Each structure stands twice: as C-alpha cells, then as structure tokens.
Design a protein around this nucleic acid. Structure first.
Length: 5
DNA sequence: GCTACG
DNA sequence: CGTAGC
C-alpha cells in the first residue's frame, strides 16, 4: 500500500 | 516516468 | 494505482 509517514 | 503525496 | 503537474 504505496508509502506514508 | 520523475516528482509528491498517500 | 491514480491523480496532479510537468
């Protein structure tokens, strides 16, 4: 799930 | 697609 | 992917 904090 | 977010 | 801005 892509990329985040 | 690289960037930047998300 | 997925939308946006280039």
């Amino acid at each position: 799930k892509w990329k985040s904090a």
